[PDB]
Symmetry: C2
Subunit: 118 residues, 2 copies
């Protein structure tokens, strides 16, 4: 009997040593699941964060498209205004020419009267 | 003659007064063209500035689209990794069950030998 109990001792101390490797593994597995489900939520958030940006940059590029037909209409108008003024410049030269012709006429009519011999 | 020259005086002083209104107008017209061609270039620039933004916000929203299939693949993978670990958790329970069955077997074989009547 005293050999058989030395056998049942070594057997227990081996099956104990096996239980403590099965716990290191159970533990390190559990931490790997923790470390994982961690990363699993960061990507959840990053995927949200990224969908906002997609919406945000999408509106912003439509606001840019609206500002552009705004400033293009204004571009058109100013160009038209450029013609109005150019036309008014033209009217303004005729008015100069008109009053010159009146200068001429008045002066000729003056000289013609100062041809009074007497 | 001395009435006719008083007439030719008043005539000149009126056609002078008319020339100086035609200059106020020529001047104020000219400034309006200046003030205009000014605005005409600001819109030129603003239209450029706006086309850059259109390009800029357009790339940025494609970079967001690329970051998203990037983080979606990663999302897929981590979910797969979640299964691997879950499977390894399962293997790890069997190994516990296996070594328990060996505990049982060894202990029964021990008791059976300690049934030595003598």
């Amino acid at each position: 009997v005293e050999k058989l109990k030395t056998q049942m001792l070594d057997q227990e101390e081996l099956l104990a040593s096996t239980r403590r490797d099965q716990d290191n593994m159970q533990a390190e597995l559990n931490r790997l699941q923790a470390e994982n489900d961690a990363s699993k939520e960061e990507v959840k958030e990053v995927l949200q964060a990224l969908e906002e940006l997609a919406v945000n940059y999408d509106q912003k590029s439509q606001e840019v498209e609206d500002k552009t037909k705004e400033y293009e209409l204004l571009s058109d108008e100013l160009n038209q205004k450029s013609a109005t003024l150019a036309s008014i410049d033209a009217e303004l030269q005729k008015l100069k020419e008109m009053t010159n012709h009146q200068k001429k006429r008045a002066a000729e009519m003056m000289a013609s009267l100062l041809k009074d011999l007497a």
